[PDB]
Amino acid sequence: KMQISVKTLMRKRITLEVEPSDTIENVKAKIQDKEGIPPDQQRLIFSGMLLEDGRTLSDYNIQKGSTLTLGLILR
Amino acid sequence: MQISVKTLMRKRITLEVEPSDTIENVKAKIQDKEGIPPDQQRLIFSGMLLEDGRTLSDYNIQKGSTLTLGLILRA
Amino acid sequence: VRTIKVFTTVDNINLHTQVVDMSMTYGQQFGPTYLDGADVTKIKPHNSHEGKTFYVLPNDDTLRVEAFEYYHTTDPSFLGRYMSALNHTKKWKYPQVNGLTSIKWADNNCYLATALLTLQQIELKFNPPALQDAYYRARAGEAANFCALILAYCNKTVGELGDVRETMSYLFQHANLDSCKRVLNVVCKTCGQQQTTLKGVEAVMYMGTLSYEQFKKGVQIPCTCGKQATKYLVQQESPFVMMSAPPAQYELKHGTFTCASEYTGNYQCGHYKHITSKETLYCIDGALLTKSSEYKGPITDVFYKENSYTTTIK
Ligand SMILES: [Br-]
Ligand SMILES: [Br-]
Ligand SMILES: [Zn+2]
């Protein structure tokens, strides 16, 4: 029959467990194991700052309980 | 420690509808398939908010068209 | 504390519910706040507002990703520019002339007329969802939102005179140009030849001749010896091609092109007109339409329709 398709932006909330000295590459990999999103298709945002793929949590002053927002680059 | 990242990923789902069903009927087709309730559902097609009392045809929603779903977030 | 329910958004697709105090101005609680064109940053909320929708600059990362997956920009000053210019384009008029949505002249919008009319004639599919849902509206006779995005994607201000050759370069980088590939070949009498193959935005744009028919035959460029080279089109795979050149008297012939643009005016102060090859040459000047049998004029850009071509030059 008909084949209508809807574009979505589903929202969720996950809880990572990390040591405040890991790298965003290490944090990106925890997302992969926990949800399945590859690190290459992973874009992270924290207070306006695009999370660099080699910087560590501390170089961005990440707290305990502070929440980051994850998007994926257009692919 | 105990860090949480919010995930807002994009998806594309394919509903099966007839070209005479209502936006109330289409909104409910999202509900069974994804779980977003119709009250928290905003749908847009070709730059136009789909009113909750018009049929697909009232928008020329032909077989193959792409709709956009938005969400009335709360807090 | 007197409050009301109102929605903040960045894309007018995902609305965020907000409760606002009726003492402090919008700009105190939300930051810069625009309501469908109007800058309401320094004004207090009124009772009539409950149930409306406001546009706000993205302040929280939840909004940055929302406004990045719809406008495809990282620039913090995009919604500031999109909303600053959409207040003006909403006041313009978009006459439907010759089955096409044009723009009635105001604030030196000459180039947006030819640009918008050319887009309805060549095959373009935009990658950003903002352009995706605003072009759709533009083809239905209402392009208020569409011309605002172009005024932001090109970083031009309402009133700032603009160039069509450059204005279409920004839309093309935000368009589905992936299966477009052009292979050029250059031949010097003493060096032999070199083949260049370029794909994407540069496979539909060229500056140096308006006659596509010439591009197959060749155009002459300086060589690395001190001598003359000859450059010619070997292969072209693209739904269309843009040929552009500095304004000059060029003659357009029926069924030879798809549409063109004319620059009748002086250097750094001018006016654009649009010529399209329907059954007979139509000259679309925004809200005025005049047909003619032939068109000899100061044409600067010519658009040709293509599917796939392979040169016959052995
Ligand atoms: Br609407
Ligand atoms: Br020479
Ligand atoms: Zn040479």
Side-chain angles (χ1 to χ4, degrees), chain A residues 2 4-10 12-18 20-23 26-27 29-33 35-51 53-54 56-62 64-75, chain B residues 1-17 19-73 75, chain C residues 1 3-41 43 45-51 53-89 91-124 126-160 162-165 167-177 179-188 190-198 200-226 228-252 254-266 268-304 306-314:
Chain A
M2 215 154 168
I4 298 174
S5 82
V6 158
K7 188 39 183 231
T8 81
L9 202 43
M10 310 306 309
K12 242 151 72 164
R13 264 211 171 121
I14 58 160
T15 56
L16 272 206
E17 173 265 349
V18 284
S21 276
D22 298 275
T23 42
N26 181 357
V27 165
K30 313 272 182 234
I31 311 285
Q32 196 220 330
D33 272 325
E35 294 281 286
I37 286 89
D40 56 35
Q41 292 173 48
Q42 215 164 81
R43 213 196 114 193
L44 269 190
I45 313 83
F46 191 21
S47 85
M49 282 177 329
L50 303 126
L51 291 199
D53 184 88
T56 291
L57 281 153
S58 160
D59 313 277
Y60 275 166
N61 178 247
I62 314 321
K64 142 88 191 47
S66 211
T67 192
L68 273 40
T69 292
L70 174 151
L72 54 78
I73 181 64
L74 305 98
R75 275 283 197 109
Chain B
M1 194 213 291
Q2 197 64 337
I3 208 163
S4 93
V5 313
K6 138 156 65 155
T7 51
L8 73 100
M9 312 308 255
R10 51 177 98 120
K11 290 187 24 213
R12 189 162 242 155
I13 67 191
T14 63
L15 291 63
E16 287 198 13
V17 201
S20 73
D21 282 9
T22 313
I23 314 291
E24 318 177 276
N25 293 112
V26 166
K27 266 181 175 149
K29 265 273 301 183
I30 291 329
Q31 162 160 65
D32 313 308
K33 270 218 155 167
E34 297 276 293
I36 287 302
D39 68 351
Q40 273 182 35
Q41 223 160 87
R42 207 176 158 241
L43 289 162
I44 279 173
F45 169 97
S46 157
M48 285 201 323
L49 215 165
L50 267 49
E51 297 171 353
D52 293 55
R54 315 272 174 222
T55 80
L56 298 193
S57 81
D58 306 288
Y59 286 123
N60 211 41
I61 310 269
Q62 58 215 354
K63 159 172 164 143
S65 273
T66 285
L67 283 139
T68 301
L69 156 57
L71 312 153
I72 287 197
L73 271 55
Chain C
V1 52
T3 76
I4 47 184
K5 140 182 77 85
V6 67
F7 308 122
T8 54
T9 178
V10 285
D11 47 14
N12 193 345
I13 279 175
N14 286 28
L15 301 154
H16 309 285
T17 313
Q18 292 291 60
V19 283
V20 315
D21 184 331
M22 304 216 327
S23 158
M24 319 168 239
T25 59
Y26 277 124
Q28 270 157 61
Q29 322 165 79
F30 289 1
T33 295
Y34 304 69
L35 168 139
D36 61 37
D39 168 16
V40 296
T41 299
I43 178 175
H46 275 80
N47 40 7
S48 56
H49 282 187
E50 165 155 356
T53 290
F54 289 63
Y55 264 92
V56 315
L57 273 61
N59 299 124
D60 43 358
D61 311 350
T62 306
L63 278 194
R64 270 164 187 94
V65 186
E66 260 185 19
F68 167 92
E69 283 209 289
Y70 185 85
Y71 297 137
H72 286 166
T73 188
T74 167
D75 264 287
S77 80
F78 188 108
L79 273 92
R81 281 216 308 301
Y82 167 65
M83 293 291 316
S84 197
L86 157 66
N87 177 6
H88 275 122
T89 83
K91 299 244 185 250
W92 294 347
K93 308 264 175 256
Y94 300 84
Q96 268 275 112
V97 75
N98 184 207
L100 280 191
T101 305
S102 167
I103 296 168
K104 162 173 144 290
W105 198 91
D107 324 298
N108 313 356
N109 64 276
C110 316
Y111 71 89
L112 292 167
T114 49
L116 172 42
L117 301 146
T118 303
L119 292 163
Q120 318 193 216
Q121 316 209 235
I122 41 163
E123 173 145 287
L124 211 37
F126 284 120
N127 265 357
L131 290 192
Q132 207 156 286
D133 297 278
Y135 196 175
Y136 292 167
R137 241 172 93 90
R139 309 205 332 226
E142 170 46 276
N145 283 49
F146 190 43
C147 318
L149 283 297
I150 305 171
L151 279 167
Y153 280 104
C154 298
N155 195 87
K156 298 242 185 206
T157 44
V158 282
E160 233 191 71
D163 167 296
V164 160
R165 86 167 73 109
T167 278
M168 303 268 299
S169 170
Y170 291 75
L171 302 200
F172 284 13
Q173 318 215 78
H174 298 83
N176 194 328
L177 271 43
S179 42
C180 287
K181 93 164 160 194
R182 198 185 261 173
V183 289
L184 307 157
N185 188 351
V186 191
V187 289
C188 186
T190 300
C191 329
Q193 70 171 310
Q194 166 80 340
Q195 211 156 302
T196 325
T197 168
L198 56 84
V201 182
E202 311 145 10
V204 297
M205 312 212 88
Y206 186 97
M207 183 85 159
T209 179
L210 317 85
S211 173
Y212 191 181
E213 261 178 34
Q214 188 129 51
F215 210 32
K216 289 279 228 216
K217 316 271 182 42
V219 196
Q220 307 279 60
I221 57 193
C223 212
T224 82
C225 314
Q228 273 206 309
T230 295
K231 179 187 266 174
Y232 74 110
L233 177 62
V234 176
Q235 171 85 74
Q236 182 66 81
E237 296 173 7
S238 55
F240 71 97
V241 283
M242 155 154 264
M243 300 270 157
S244 43
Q249 301 267 330
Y250 189 53
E251 201 228 340
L252 300 173
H254 173 43
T256 316
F257 56 110
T258 292
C259 73
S261 305
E262 161 196 290
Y263 198 28
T264 291
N266 199 237
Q268 321 158 310
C269 166
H271 189 324
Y272 276 114
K273 285 145 132 139
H274 187 74
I275 294 100
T276 184
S277 164
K278 309 303 180 167
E279 92 270 18
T280 183
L281 300 187
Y282 288 109
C283 159
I284 315 149
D285 204 326
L288 315 152
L289 160 64
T290 87
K291 62 148 153 158
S292 37
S293 275
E294 273 156 40
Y295 201 88
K296 214 216 175 166
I299 305 301
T300 176
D301 305 326
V302 188
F303 296 81
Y304 306 81
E306 189 149 16
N307 175 15
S308 166
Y309 274 63
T310 54
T311 194
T312 181
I313 300 188
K314 213 77 182 199

